[PDB]
Amino acid sequence: VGSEVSDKRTCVSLTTQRLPVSRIKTYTITEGSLRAVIFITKRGLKVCADPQATWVRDVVRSMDRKSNTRNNMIQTKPTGTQQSTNTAVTLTG
Numbered sequence: 001v002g003s004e005v006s007d008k009r010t011c012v013s014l015t016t017q018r019l020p021v022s023r024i025k026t027y028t029i030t031e032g033s034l035r036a037v038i039f040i041t042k043r044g045l046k047v048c049a050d051p052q053a054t055w056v057r058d059v060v061r062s063m064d065r066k067s068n069t070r071n072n073m074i075q076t077k078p079t080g081t082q083q084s085t086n087t088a089v090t091l092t093g
Helices: 054-066
Strands: 024-029 037-041 046-049
Touching: 024 054, 037 054
Parallel strands: none
Antiparallel strands: 024 037, 037 046
Protein backbone atom coordinates (compact mmCIF):
# COMPACT_ATOMS: atom_id res chain seq x y z
CA VAL A 1 0.00 0.00 0.00
CA GLY A 2 2.71 2.41 1.08
CA SER A 3 6.03 2.42 2.89
CA GLU A 4 9.77 2.92 2.54
CA VAL A 5 11.93 1.40 -0.17
CA SER A 6 9.41 1.39 -2.99
CA ASP A 7 12.02 0.60 -5.61
CA LYS A 8 15.17 -0.37 -3.75
CA ARG A 9 18.73 -0.25 -5.03
CA THR A 10 19.39 -3.63 -6.59
CA CYS A 11 15.98 -4.73 -7.80
CA VAL A 12 13.14 -7.08 -6.92
CA SER A 13 13.36 -10.39 -8.73
CA LEU A 14 15.58 -11.85 -11.43
CA THR A 15 14.36 -10.74 -14.84
CA THR A 16 10.74 -11.53 -15.64
CA GLN A 17 10.66 -8.28 -17.58
CA ARG A 18 12.48 -8.34 -20.90
CA LEU A 19 13.00 -4.60 -21.25
CA PRO A 20 14.20 -3.25 -24.60
CA VAL A 21 17.72 -1.88 -24.72
CA SER A 22 16.08 1.19 -26.20
CA ARG A 23 14.38 1.60 -22.85
CA ILE A 24 17.62 0.88 -21.03
CA LYS A 25 20.47 3.31 -20.49
CA THR A 26 23.39 1.70 -18.70
CA TYR A 27 24.05 -1.65 -17.06
CA THR A 28 26.10 -3.00 -14.17
CA ILE A 29 27.30 -6.57 -13.75
CA THR A 30 28.73 -7.79 -10.46
CA GLU A 31 31.02 -10.72 -9.74
CA GLY A 32 30.44 -11.03 -6.01
CA SER A 33 27.72 -13.09 -4.37
CA LEU A 34 25.49 -10.80 -6.40
CA ARG A 35 26.79 -11.94 -9.77
CA ALA A 36 23.74 -10.33 -11.33
CA VAL A 37 23.20 -8.01 -14.27
CA ILE A 38 21.82 -4.62 -13.31
CA PHE A 39 20.00 -2.71 -16.02
CA ILE A 40 19.45 1.00 -15.56
CA THR A 41 16.83 2.78 -17.63
CA LYS A 42 16.68 6.39 -18.75
CA ARG A 43 13.88 6.63 -16.21
CA GLY A 44 16.26 5.78 -13.40
CA LEU A 45 14.63 2.41 -12.80
CA LYS A 46 17.31 -0.19 -12.22
CA VAL A 47 16.58 -3.90 -12.38
CA CYS A 48 18.63 -7.05 -11.91
CA ALA A 49 18.73 -10.08 -14.17
CA ASP A 50 20.46 -13.44 -14.36
CA PRO A 51 23.46 -13.51 -16.70
CA GLN A 52 22.49 -17.10 -17.40
CA ALA A 53 20.00 -15.80 -19.94
CA THR A 54 21.23 -15.54 -23.51
CA TRP A 55 18.70 -12.84 -24.29
CA VAL A 56 20.25 -10.90 -21.43
CA ARG A 57 23.77 -11.46 -22.71
CA ASP A 58 22.56 -10.35 -26.12
CA VAL A 59 21.01 -7.21 -24.71
CA VAL A 60 24.11 -6.64 -22.61
CA ARG A 61 26.14 -6.64 -25.81
CA SER A 62 24.01 -3.85 -27.22
CA MET A 63 23.72 -2.04 -23.90
CA ASP A 64 27.44 -1.44 -24.18
CA ARG A 65 26.87 0.27 -27.50
CA LYS A 66 23.86 2.08 -26.10
CA SER A 67 26.02 3.39 -23.28
CA ASN A 68 29.39 3.08 -24.96
CA THR A 69 30.13 6.79 -24.81
CA ARG A 70 27.91 7.74 -21.90
CA ASN A 71 28.05 5.03 -19.26
CA ASN A 72 31.29 6.39 -17.87
CA MET A 73 33.99 6.92 -20.47
CA ILE A 74 36.19 8.59 -17.88
CA GLN A 75 38.45 7.77 -14.95
CA THR A 76 39.26 10.49 -12.45
CA LYS A 77 42.85 10.73 -11.29
CA PRO A 78 43.14 10.10 -7.54
CA THR A 79 46.12 11.08 -5.42
CA GLY A 80 48.81 8.79 -4.05
CA THR A 81 52.13 9.61 -2.43
CA GLN A 82 55.82 9.71 -3.26
CA GLN A 83 59.16 8.03 -2.67
CA SER A 84 62.89 8.72 -2.77
CA THR A 85 66.30 7.31 -1.94
CA ASN A 86 69.82 8.39 -1.08
CA THR A 87 73.34 7.00 -1.08
CA ALA A 88 76.84 7.60 0.24
CA VAL A 89 80.08 6.23 -1.16
CA THR A 90 83.42 7.98 -1.55
CA LEU A 91 86.62 6.77 -3.18
CA THR A 92 88.78 4.57 -0.99
CA GLY A 93 92.03 5.91 0.42
